[PDB]
């Protein structure tokens, strides 16, 4: 016959929004470790009732680059880092519009800079009311793909606060296997990301061993006796080939520049360990790798005058501690883009990452924040008296 409308309440329909979310973060509120200091001051001890009420046959495109929840975590972290980390003398730049003399005059900013500590907190993200944080048990997606056997949460899972480049420390791991994240193969900047389904050992020790500080008118010299690993890189290459089929697989070019994009740059003693492109960056893949063959060696050392991943401009940290440091880790994956172009003939090379908005997005492809739209419309044969 004819068709008429109904509308009703509460019928889980969670269209998009990406608003503020609150943390769930069990600090100690006692340890001087600034991680927990922030995790309690501006963050809150944990939520004990998360209910992953698993989805049925959803089809939702957990597009991992339209999730401003990730930007929100980003800005939360940038908020964390600065009362966390104390730059002695920050030389940040500025100009005020004057068409070409835009007054880019170096703004020096002095402060006080002692040490505290560094130890991540798996924080979690918590939708506001009427909002639901869709998760994803599938992780593949090609980058953009749903998940059958996941659903909502109340607060999220642990997403820690350490930052590093192409390779993390003390951080997440990968759930099922190694998958990748990108799109079109015409020009290919489109940074690719892998989550590596095993762990790896990275450990740097330096008790004193170098009492003599300078060389001329070494303590900053750090030797990272690590491991050996390689087979995870074989899984690396086999994946790469599964997406780069007919070509071999190199890296072949770490051009350089600002140290933080190329070198393994990771946070320990508040500072980082900066070496060249000599290590583990080399092998080619036609059906074999190209390297060789406990804590043996790899030479990544510390600097002091760093750049910020946060806002452009330098920073000037403190002289280090006498020695006896160590940091372990559990690599979740890696950060890579083809060193591509059009000069190339049938060898293929991947090459590097320094944008956090993905550095903490190999952990949030699942999380899609939504409101509720619990008012719903549908057809019936419902109409009133005349």
């Amino acid at each position: 016959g004819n068709l008429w409308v109904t509308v009703y309440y509460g019928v889980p329909v969670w269209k998009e929004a990406t608003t503020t979310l609150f943390c769930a973060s069990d600090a100690k509120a006692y340890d001087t470790e600034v991680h927990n200091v922030w995790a309690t001051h501006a963050c809150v001890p944990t939520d004990p009732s998360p209910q992953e009420l698993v989805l049925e046959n959803v089809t939702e495109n957990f597009n991992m680059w339209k999730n401003e929840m990730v930007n929100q975590m980003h800005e939360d972290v940038i908020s964390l880092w600065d009362q966390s980390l104390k730059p002695c003398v920050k030389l940040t730049p500025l100009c005020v519009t004057l068409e070409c003399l835009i007054n880019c005059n170096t703004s020096a900013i002095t402060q006080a800079c002692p040490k505290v500590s560094f130890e991540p907190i798996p924080i979690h993200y918590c939708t506001p009311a009427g909002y639901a944080i869709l998760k994803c048990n599938d992780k593949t997606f090609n980058g953009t793909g749903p998940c059958h056997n996941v659903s909502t949460v109340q607060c999220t899972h642990g997403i820690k606060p350490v930052v590093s480049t192409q390779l993390l420390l003390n951080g997440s791991l990968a759930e099922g296997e190694i998958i990748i994240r990108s799109e079109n193969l015409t020009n290919n900047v489109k940074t690719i990301l892998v989550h590596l389904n095993q762990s790896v050992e990275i450990v740097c020790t330096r008790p004193n061993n170098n009492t003599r500080k300078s060389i001329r008118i070494d303590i900053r010299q750090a030797h990272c006796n690590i491991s050996k690993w390689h087979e995870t890189l074989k899984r690396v290459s086999e994946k790469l080939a599964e997406h780069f089929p007919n070509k071999t697989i190199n890296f072949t070019s770490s051009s350089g520049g600002d140290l933080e994009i190329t070198t393994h740059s990771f946070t320990c003693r508040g500072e980082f360990f900066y070496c060249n492109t000599s290590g583990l960056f080399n092998s080619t893949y036609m059906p074999n790798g190209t390297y060789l063959h406990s804590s043996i060696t790899i030479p990544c050392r510390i600097k002091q005058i760093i750049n910020m991943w946060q806002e452009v401009g330098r920073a000037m940290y403190a002289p280090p501690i006498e020695g006896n440091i160590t940091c372990k880790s559990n690599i979740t994956g890696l950060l890579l883009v083809r060193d591509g172009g059009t000069e190339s003939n049938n060898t293929e090379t991947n090459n590097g990452g320094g944008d956090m908005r993905d550095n903490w997005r190999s952990e949030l492809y699942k999380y899609k924040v939504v409101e509720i739209k619990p008012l719903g419309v549908a057809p019936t044969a419902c109409k009133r008296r005349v």
């Binding site: 953009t144 799109e183 079109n184 015409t186 020009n187 489109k190 059009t342």
Partner: protein, 177 residues
Amino acid sequence: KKVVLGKKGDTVELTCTASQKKSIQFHWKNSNQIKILGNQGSFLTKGPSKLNDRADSRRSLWDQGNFPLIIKNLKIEDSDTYICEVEDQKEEVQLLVFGLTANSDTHLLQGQSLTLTLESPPGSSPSVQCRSPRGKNIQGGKTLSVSQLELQDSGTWTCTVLQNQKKVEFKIDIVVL
């Protein structure tokens, strides 16, 4: 990878493919994914960028599945990778636009000298192969100069610059008196 080039005063074209040929949702977004130009159904979301005043697209073509993107009056800052994400892939153009000029403005004399300036955008390793009405193949990098400038050098100079597999022609106008 597929580059384009400009001339600091020209326009340029950037391409987006689509197999349904149907005007489906595309968005044009630069390196770190600001929104620049986007098909929202049957509409174009002039994104919040440096290019809220310039960029555009041939609009008719969409119902064909070919979505373009132009950058009118290129200045060296519009030089950046872009991206088009029509359905499941993210085609990236890469635009490295520059321009060039000479030192002399209105007044020259015979036996004097003139120099060059090419306003490249960062990250470029070009090579300036430059010409003359007299066949002065000034072979070198950026700053091209010659110690001999004569009345016979009158007439503009076809200057060119190779930035990663392409060039684009140039005036170097020469007038006496």
